[PDB]
């Protein structure tokens, strides 16, 4: 069966959310109260504390800067690291809503749709899910492998400064006793701090894909029940309000995370464009800086695209049922379809801490701001 | 009882609005026609005239500037002072509407809500009220104490220019006979001119908190009356129209005050960022200039947040009642819920003299404008 | 009677529209086919041709510029002159719609309003009409008197270049035979080219004031007919659709005129701010350049304010009738009030050639653009 | 008959779409399965491959640039060429939807309209169609003739570098054996690569004109059927939903094409304004660069105008039927007119890959961006 295949994938997503050290909540397939184990709790606490102290050493390493170039070289990695920290806190706080969200993915079976549509819907869902997940995973692995292991192959196979950008430490970390084990520590902390927000964006993309498929199924079900008494309309309205409650749940955690993400990502792409444009770099960091740019652009573009698709499917749900049969229906249908339309006129939008609406036009406005500040930072030299 | 506690707090707000010299109007708890006393009227007239002449000496002290730096050092304090003057005039003119607003806070008892919700609503209201009031009060006291008493401890405990920025005066004010009593006069005028707009923003924050709680109570009451004849719907519509009339009353006074506030606050934060960035300041004004920045950002952020919450609660009221029961109701309910929704689609927004809508996105746009003009003013040196 | 007073004023407006040389159309009070006279037609043709040739000499005088300063000194007057020419053409083309507009001002009597409201409405209408008309007229007279007669009192009472900015001419116009009669010709052409667009803005302000009063009367009439069968609702809907047809008529002519006006006015205020800031002017043109700025700002602000008031009154008409009585009315009232509301949700907006919406926020955006280009033009020196 | 005349014109449009080498689809007048011929398929494949290799040589000719000036001189032509390539791909992919679109133009006969309106509608349609088609065709022919044949008349009638801007080639192309035949090849490739997107914009303009006429006919038909049972309303709703399906079909292909078009057109007009402003050009390319500017501005303005007209006609359809008769109709009419209005409130907008809405305000925003980047590129020299 194809459907049990879908089961596999959502279990994998839950597994990855417990690999990178998020707080363990109840998965739908788990029914032995396994998430309350201490063996998985000390894991998440250890990884969260390690990420916190690494981000704090990097953040106070920024304020103790030598010049402008070291400041920007700290700005990029500290931006990504505090993105990871904001994501850690936001998944720590709202643990209960994630269980309801994963229960929504487990069963979402729409009633009233023709049976020929569900198969192609499941195939498109699995294809797009596999695409976004493997894309972000492979780009993350290549970027980490370059940025972390490329300077090690210059010296460790056989003077100082193995890592690309230094940070604040209580130890000296310049002598040969300490710098290698600092590099190893930075490697494993880099693994976890990269793995957390990528997994969060993967889960958000899965949720948006499922909500798009659900809204298309709802529109087809409205057309099917109008082509043909009350109970079908009650089930339609209940699915339409369940979708709205689910998006209202998704709004909060990703509101805080998206505000932090978008601001620090704009800072990171501006600093990267300055490093690639002006300063005569050492050419061993061009394959890192040309992959971090593509990762940032791909992540922002995928988030904005899957946030625009949901609003477009809601507005497409507004035009559902409007045909010649609606004129010939009773007063009951002409009232409930009117109610469904005037509720569907309100768009389902994910806002970033209510400062902006995550759309595709916001990507164009932010790219304009990035171009302006890149021109300014280039002129300042 | 908790509820009588709320009584205490609104009385305190009225008391503070008569301490800082606003025009005395009838409070709800007062029932002896006490507000028409001359003993409280000559107070407000004396304080308003003193604030007017102090703001006028500061304003014509700006045009008689020596250079650019003295001009900006006048620009900050004159911006805050004419904010205070605009607030004084706006509370002088519309005295009658403030009585209806304080009568709205005295009794606002929603009918039809389940009894278990009102307790937590009152607790959240008291907590957020105490938070915003004590926050702005303590920051104002620390900022005034620094800016006014820190230069006095250099000289008065034992050459000229005790105050930080000079102003126009008919007296000489440079000689030792006059400068000390000018400093004392500036201290008490500083107390009143700081105390007025902070108290106005505290009252606006109280009103927005109460309107948010009222809208949430209305949504819960709609859900409760749909879960269960006409009279409940009439009471719901009457509460919904009373909220709209109250916001329409709040719109005007704070429209004029918010236009003045936002423009002069942008000017003040730009001039402060220039003083903190470039000019080698004397380090005795860094604790003043680093608290005035935090006060400005906190005040603007709290105003924008509590103006966004009301619009979000209105749009959340639009989605109320939409469920399976609405399909099974009569024509009467399906008409009145439709009317409530198509009225709730119009957002309750506080505009600043109709030039802009006070939202959280406006804070981002204004911060972008502040960053652009700070870059320009830094480049001009 | 007060009402016949209103008659007087609209007749005066028609009279002024035929003084400045617009194409003569039928006024409401005229009933002898007087507008088809040739005695008033050769007037308008002569004045329009004179304004055309003066604007053409000024426009080709701009392209034959000596430097940047003479180019901007031509830019200001040519901007105002081609505003006048666009207004002349737009009133020449649509002569028929102006008759229907002046017939709308002649009789607009709303039915169903309480009688106590109409008196205060007429008083407020006459007050605001007199205010805007006398304000723009007196500022125009002072600006023309300064700019035209102030250099004449230096020389003509007793070497060359009497006028402030020269233009292209076939004659020499530098010798003493010709320059005085060129100055006289420029004086009378200046009178007509100033008098035309000011009269057009006065008529637009009158129309917006009347539409605001009409919408407030309609809202009060809806409240009155809901407080109390079908015929009142038919009269309400007919007045509401007549207001929309009138605004749709007003949209076109002022769309073209407002596009030209706003663009050339932004150019003029930028060039004036450059002349007042940098160049060491001769101080005999400071009273002209400081009145032209105030006239431009006052005209733009009054147009934007009276365009925002109409949209606000439409959205206020959306909330009319919504009360406890609407729940207790029949199906007929609950359907027609719903229809009135869903039609009133569409805003009555005057757009400038569909490029922008004339609001008060547009004034803030245009002022930001003016500040940016003033900073650039100051930096270019 | 006039109507058969319309037939002629749409056949001509189909003919031109098969002249410039687009993929051949079934026209409405063709009924012998002529579009599946190989004689017309190898034509389109040959022209598409030639345009691809020419665009690829120009695109890799950009990256192998000598300086900034040669880079911009490549940027303009490569922008137009990749516009042509994106249009080629977008017409290759969606071949099936173009058949339904051309079947919509073949028969669109509205039922219920008064007969006196259709004649003037057809006359206005033919006039505007002929205007836009002949305008873009004549400007394209003059621009191509100038840019391609003007340097040939300097040398070929009787040292190197016949073409204006060079490109990458495997051949030498500088010697006299090869440069002439390279110029001939560039001439014919220039013909096809210019002829494709102009024909696409002509078809889009035809579609927007027809949709505007259809919406006006629908509004007049609503007024006519309200002036007078169910079947007329069913036909009205079916025409209104057919218009929406047609615009939803038009959205996709022109979404991708409009995104590419608008971005590369902004780049091209910025580079052209730099070439015309600063660099001492050879004056033989001023008649080319002053026609390419007018072509770009005319094309963008016509696209934005005919995209704004459709949204304005939809919002005008929202106000249809609202009169005194609607109050006196049955419940059926007052429900179906309400449904038509609440569906017509959603605007029919053509978005460019969902990044922006093609309006006339977007033209103003893009012109502001063009002015800013032109000022920057002028300052960089
Ligand atoms: C900058 C984040 N980072 C830590 C240094 C990386 O290795 C890195 C680089 C490129 C792309 C990705 C997903 C991670
Ligand atoms: C600038 C206003 N002011 C008068 C000089 C102050 O003392 C002051 C400084 C910081 C924060 C607050 C609330 C007041
Ligand atoms: C610039 C237009 N103008 C002709 C030179 C004037 O005299 C002028 C100057 C200021 C204000 C007004 C209404 C007209
Ligand atoms: C830049 C495109 N191009 C190829 C060089 C042209 O000949 C060209 C120039 C002006 C106007 C038009 C429609 C085409």
Residue numbers in the entry:
A (entry chain A), B (entry chain D), C (entry chain C), D (entry chain B): 12 to 169, 178 to 247, 317 to 469
Quote the original article.
To investigate the diversity of binding modes used by different ligands, we determined the 2.9 Å structure of MhOR5 in complex with the insect repellent DEET. The S7b helices in the DEET-bound structure were dilated to a diameter of 8.7 Å, indicating that different ligands elicit a common conformational change to gate the pore. Density corresponding to DEET localized to the same binding pocket as eugenol, encased within the same box-like configuration of aromatic and aliphatic side chains. As with eugenol, computational docking of DEET yielded multiple poses with comparable docking scores that fit the experimental density well. Whereas each of the top poses was predicted to adopt a distinct orientation, all were stabilized through a similar complement of hydrophobic and/or π-stacking interactions. The constellation of amino acids lining the binding pocket retains the same overall geometry in both structures, leaving the architecture of the hydrophobic box largely unchanged. However, a small displacement of the S4 helix results in expansion of the pocket, probably to accommodate the longer aliphatic moiety of DEET and avoid a steric clash with the side chain of Met209. Mutation of Met209 to smaller hydrophobic amino acids (valine or alanine) enhanced the affinity of DEET. Conversely, mutation of Ile213, another aliphatic S4 residue that lies in close proximity to DEET, to the larger residue methionine abolished DEET sensitivity but marginally altered eugenol signalling. Binding of DEET to the same site offers structural corroboration that this insect repellent might exploit the promiscuity of diverse ORs and serve as a molecular ‘confusant’ by scrambling the olfactory code.
MhORs thus autonomously assemble as homotetrameric odorant-gated ion channels and display the divergent chemical tuning profiles typical of this receptor family. Using cryo-electron microscopy, we elucidated the structure of MhOR5 in multiple gating states, alone and in complex with two of its agonists—the odorant eugenol and the insect repellent DEET. As in Orco, each MhOR5 subunit contributes a single helix (S7b) to the central ion conduction pathway, and their S0–S6 helices form a loosely packed domain that projects radially away from the pore axis.
